[PDB]
């Protein structure tokens, strides 16, 4: 049964507004003039005015930029001195722009490793979240990297981090508590699979007995 498909509108759109989205028509306009109006969130119930229509032509318009991370989808109902048609469900989908950076769940992550641990030993896990669409885009696909290690002894790279999981592991023998009891790592989480927006955090690794 012929229905209007979901209307997709990207967020963060620039001017000028109003901007046309879709036109709806009732073939009952053949006999006489029809008055169009829409209801729902974004037009009737809050929020208000985001989506409007002009009753003479039936052009569904948007009047201000959208934000997918607030309202991801709208559902409206189009209408036509008497009712002409049973209401039509008009679904509006806000498509994603990469406008949020990955954030670590905390600023400092604590972790501990045993001295003499063999390479591959899991030390700790850092975690970040990105608020963008991680199912239809890469705007939330996070890669983890190590930006620095302090100190650089016995080796410059005592640890590695898994690009996808954030697990930090030992890669080199020689961890010694009496020698170097603490390591500080700056970790970065970037979206677009590591090529996009980033933030940093700190991992503090204590070497135990």
């Amino acid at each position: 049964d012929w229905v209007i498909p979901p209307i997709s509108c990207p967020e963060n759109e620039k001017g000028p507004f109003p901007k046309n989205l879709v036109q709806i028509k009732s073939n009952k306009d053949k006999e006489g003039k029809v008055f169009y109006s829409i209801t729902g969130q974004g037009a009737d119930t809050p929020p208000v005015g985001v989506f409007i229509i002009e009753r003479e032509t039936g052009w569904l318009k948007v009047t201000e930029p959208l934000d997918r991370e607030r309202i991801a989808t709208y559902t409206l109902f189009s209408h036509a001195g008497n009712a002409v048609e049973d209401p039509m469900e008009i679904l509006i989908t806000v498509t994603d722009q990469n406008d949020n950076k990955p954030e670590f769940t905390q600023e400092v992550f604590k972790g501990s490793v045993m001295e003499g641990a063999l390479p591959g030993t899991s030390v700790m896990e850092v975690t970040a979240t990105d608020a963008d669409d991680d199912v239809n885009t890469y705007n939330a696909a996070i890669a983890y990297t190590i930006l620095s290690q302090d100190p650089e002894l016995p080796d410059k790279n005592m640890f590695t981090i898994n690009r996808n999981t954030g697990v930090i592991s030992v890669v080199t023998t020689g961890l010694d508590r009496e020698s170097f009891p603490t390591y500080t790592l700056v970790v970065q989480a970037a979206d677009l699979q590591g090529e996009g927006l980033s933030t940093t955090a700190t991992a503090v690794i204590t070497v135990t007995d």
């Epitope: 406008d99 950076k101 930006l147 620095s148 500080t184 700056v186 927006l197 940093t200």
Partner: antibody, heavy 116, light 108 residues
Framework: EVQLQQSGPELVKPGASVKISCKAS????????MNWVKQSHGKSLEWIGR????????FYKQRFKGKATLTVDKSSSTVHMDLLSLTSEDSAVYYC?????????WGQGTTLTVSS | DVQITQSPSYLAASPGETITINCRTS??????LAWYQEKPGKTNKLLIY???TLQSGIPSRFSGSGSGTDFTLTISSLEPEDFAMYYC?????????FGGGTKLEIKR
């Protein structure tokens, strides 16, 4: 107390090159990216690029590739910026600043005058 | 590149007043905008980072707001020290970029 101390003013003829240095202290040097910012007289601030002191990894603003080279010397907690094939348009104050994103500490600036 | 329009360029006020400085950006940069203060003979001073986070050592009469494309630095109850040059900078993405600046001069 963090402190970024820059090298003194440079007066060079056009066509020459200069290396401006910035020495950091008061914090773990490799923990923060270092940045260079240009400010021409009367003009606004312009970010040139950064370097990761841990591994020398650099990123440049496009219009400074081939004009600016960033290097680092970990043993002395110093970052260097090379400016090549200098012109009067290069005459400016140049700042180093600490930070991977925003710059919570700045140097006092180095003045470059390019004139024959 | 993220272009930033910082307005106004010049602004005259007296101690005790509240003033605002605005930066509009050409891309949605979420919250990642920072404000700096410039004074002769002093290294530049970070006031706010990430839109509204007050930096250590800065009094709370400096406050930031906004997210997306419109940001405001607000300075309440101006002290004589506050009359200076002010810059915003987006720290959202390379290349980092700055607003054109605002000179806060003292009424007379």
């Amino acid at each position: 107390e963090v402190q970024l101390q820059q090298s003194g003013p440079e007066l060079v003829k056009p066509g020459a090159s200069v290396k401006i240095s910035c020495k950091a202290s008061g914090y773990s040097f490799t923990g923060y990216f270092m940045n260079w910012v240009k400010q021409s007289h009367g003009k606004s601030l312009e970010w040139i690029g950064r370097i990761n002191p841990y591994n020398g990894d650099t990123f440049y603003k496009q219009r400074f590739k081939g004009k600016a080279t960033l290097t680092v010397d970990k043993s002395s907690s110093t970052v260097h910026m090379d400016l090549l094939s200098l012109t009067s348009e290069d005459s400016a104050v140049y700042y180093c600043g600490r930070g991977n994103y925003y710059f919570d500490y700045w140097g006092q600036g180095t003045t470059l005058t390019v004139s024959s | 590149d993220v272009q930033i329009t910082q307005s106004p360029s010049y602004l005259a006020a007296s101690p005790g007043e509240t003033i605002t400085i605005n930066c509009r950006t050409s891309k949605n940069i979420s919250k990642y905008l920072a404000w700096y203060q410039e004074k002769p003979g002093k290294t530049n001073k970070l006031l706010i980072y990430s839109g509204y986070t007050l930096q250590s050592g800065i009094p709370s009469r400096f406050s930031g707001s906004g997210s997306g494309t419109d940001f405001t630095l607000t300075i309440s109850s101006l002290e004589p020290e506050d009359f200076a040059m002010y810059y915003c900078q987006q720290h959202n993405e390379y290349p980092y970029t700055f607003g054109g600046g605002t000179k806060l001069e003292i009424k007379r």
